[PDB]
Amino acid sequence: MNTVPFTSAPIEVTIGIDQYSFNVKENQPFHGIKDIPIGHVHVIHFQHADNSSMRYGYWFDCRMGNFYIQYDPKDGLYKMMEERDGAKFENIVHNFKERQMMVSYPKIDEDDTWYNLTEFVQMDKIRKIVRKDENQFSYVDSSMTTVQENELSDPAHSLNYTVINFKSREAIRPGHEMEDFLDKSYYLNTVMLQGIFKNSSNYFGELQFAFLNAMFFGNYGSSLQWHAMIELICSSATVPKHMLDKLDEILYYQIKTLPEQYSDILLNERVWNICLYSSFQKNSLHNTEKIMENKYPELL
Amino acid sequence: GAMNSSNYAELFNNDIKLFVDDTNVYRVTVHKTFEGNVATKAINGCIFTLNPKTGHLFLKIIHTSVWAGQKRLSQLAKWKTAEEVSALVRSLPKEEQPKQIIVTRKAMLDPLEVHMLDFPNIAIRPTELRLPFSAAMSIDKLSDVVMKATEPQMVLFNIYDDWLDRISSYTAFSRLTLLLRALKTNEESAKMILLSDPTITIKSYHLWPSFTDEQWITIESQMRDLILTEYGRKYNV
Numbered sequence: 001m002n003t004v005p006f007t008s009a010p011i012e013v014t015i016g017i018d019q020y021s022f023n024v025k026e027n028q029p030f031h032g033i034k035d036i037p038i039g040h041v042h043v044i045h046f047q048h049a050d051n052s053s054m055r056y057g058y059w060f061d062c063r064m065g066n067f068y069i070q071y072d073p074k075d076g077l078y079k080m081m082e083e084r085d086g087a088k089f090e091n092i093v094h095n096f097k098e099r100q101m102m103v104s105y106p107k108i109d110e111d112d113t114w115y116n117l118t119e120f121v122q123m124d125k126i127r128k129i130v131r132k133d134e135n136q137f138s139y140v141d142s143s144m145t146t147v148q149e150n151e152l153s154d155p156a157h158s159l160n161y162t163v164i165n166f167k168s169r170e171a172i173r174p175g176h177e178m179e180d181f182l183d184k185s186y187y188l189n190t191v192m193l194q195g196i197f198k199n200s201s202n203y204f205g206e207l208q209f210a211f212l213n214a215m216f217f218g219n220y221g222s223s224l225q226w227h228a229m230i231e232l233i234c235s236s237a238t239v240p241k242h243m244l245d246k247l248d249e250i251l252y253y254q255i256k257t258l259p260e261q262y263s264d265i266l267l268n269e270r271v272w273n274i275c276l277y278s279s280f281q282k283n284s285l286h287n288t289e290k291i292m293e294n295k296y297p298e299l300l
Numbered sequence: 301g302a303m304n305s306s307n308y309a310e311l312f313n314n315d316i317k318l319f320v321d322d323t324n325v326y327r328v329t330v331h332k333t334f335e336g337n338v339a340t341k342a343i344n345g346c347i348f349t350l351n352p353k354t355g356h357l358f359l360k361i362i363h364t365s366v367w368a369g370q371k372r373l374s375q376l377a378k379w380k381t382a383e384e385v386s387a388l389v390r391s392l393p394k395e396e397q398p399k400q401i402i403v404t405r406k407a408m409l410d411p412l413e414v415h416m417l418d419f420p421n422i423a424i425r426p427t428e429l430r431l432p433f434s435a436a437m438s439i440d441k442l443s444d445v446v447m448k449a450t451e452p453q454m455v456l457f458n459i460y461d462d463w464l465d466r467i468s469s470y471t472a473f474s475r476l477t478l479l480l481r482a483l484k485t486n487e488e489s490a491k492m493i494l495l496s497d498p499t500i501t502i503k504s505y506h507l508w509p510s511f512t513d514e515q516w517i518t519i520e521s522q523m524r525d526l527i528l529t530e531y532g533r534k535y536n537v
């Protein structure tokens with residue numbers, strides 16, 4: 001089990017770690033989060049009490065370094081930093097543990113939620129979507145735009161998701177216009193899976209990362225990317241059976257985890273009705289269709 | 301965006317544009333089978349592609365063989381329309397290619413946009429105008445060339461005959477849409493009006509009769525009356 005220590009908490013803030021969250025008061029004696037499961041990426045995220053504008057946070061993997069948070073009063077946010085000195089950091093983590101100034105990552109033993117949401121998410125792929133190569137962790141916030149959004153403005157602060165555009169020469173073979181537009185299998189299997197992502201695991205990893213950024217930061221371009229990646233599969237008549245079965249599991253846990261009260265802004269009615277009731281795969285997403293119909297029957 | 305009453309004079313400016321109407325691409329007669337089921341029989345169709353400024357009509361005849369062995373013909377028809385319009389554009393010299401293509405039915409937007417990806421600078425637009433181009437097959441000479449076709453064929457017409465020698469494009473389009481609206485509302489009456497006076501003929505190289513300016517005013521008034529006459533007969537007013 002790993003630990004993210006905090007030098008202090010000088011401003012009142014709601015702190016999230018993965019799907020969990022807790023409130024810290026101004027100058028409360030909080031010095032971080034312990035018992036973080038090894039083996040998964042994690043996200044530690046923030047929403048200030050005095051300005052809920054900007055949720056922001058950091059994707060990290062404790063296997064890649066020793067990371068801690070300290071608030072910067074100049075830039076006005078909690079920053080993630082790496083300590084190279086293992087000895088000193090291990091000592092800092094121990095002294096804080098002894099004084100019981102840390103919250104415990106509150107994972108129920110039965111509970112596979114976080115694994116199920118991050119199954120295909122790798123830190124090495126996050127760092128190619130979020131470019132800041134001098135750090136081992138990745139900063140995301142509510143306002144960051146995607147490369148695709150920027151084409152339709154600061155490039156260094158963008159989310160470099162794979163561009164998906166159903167009315168593009170990449171998506172449409174000359175002479176197969178109707179075929180490729182009505183059945184997106186060529187675009188899914190040859191262009192995206194074989195060509196760009198190399199395998200379905202990398203595709204699912206980007207899909208899952210896009211969802212998590214939409215949910216945790218309200219990042220609108222991330223929500224667009226998540227839905228586009230769903231729609232590209234659902235709109236394909238020829239999808240490997242193992243991908244359909246895995247997609248159903250991925251979406252099920254995503255819909256299960258979504259706050260009931262954020263559905264109006266995180267779920268696109270057109271995409272979901274198309275995918276569940278019109279598309280080629282309308283009968284291939286049994287688990288997802290059942291949870292959607294029982295949890296969000298209004299959307300449908 | 302969409303073309304409507306507010307931006308109507310844009311049709312007659314000097315930016316090349318084409319209307320595309322796909323109504324008459326896929327045409328069928330519905331009939332009973334020996335077993336008492338229903339079946340369709342396709343008949344030849346046409347794409348109606350019109351430059352409203354010049355009157356140039358690119359009538360692409362759609363022969364029934366294009367449907368042989370195909371499924372979902374009403375959907376295929378929009379894509380075949382878009383394929384043929386795209387082929388037409390590629391066939392034109394660069395300086396004759398349209399800047400905009402206005403489709404008369406919104407279901408043509410995606411088929412045409414996808415077929416025109418190679419032309420990102422050609423705008424594909426809908427319209428809120430209810431244009432009467434479906435009645436094109438009530439123009440005898442157009443109907444004749446479509447029905448007589450034994451293979452795919454493109455035939456070029458000027459739908460304004462020689463009117464532009466005497467009137468502006470705006471007025472010529474207004475006359476055309478009035479004529480077509482009448483033929484669409486009551487084809488028999490409309491055609492009676494157009495031919496009632498045997499001394500006025502249709503030239504071999506024209507589609508409509510050789511009316512004088514004064515006779516066109518009379519004809520135009522008779523067409524308006526017809527549209528109103530039918531409108532009362534229809535709604536009881």
Ligand SMILES: Cc1noc(C)c1CN(C)C(=O)C(C)(C)N
Pocket residue numbers: 005006007067068069070083088089092
């Ligand atoms: C808190 C916490 N976690 O790891 C470390 C390391 C600290 C304390 N940090 C702030 C330090 O000692 C220096 C000054 C080098 N940044």
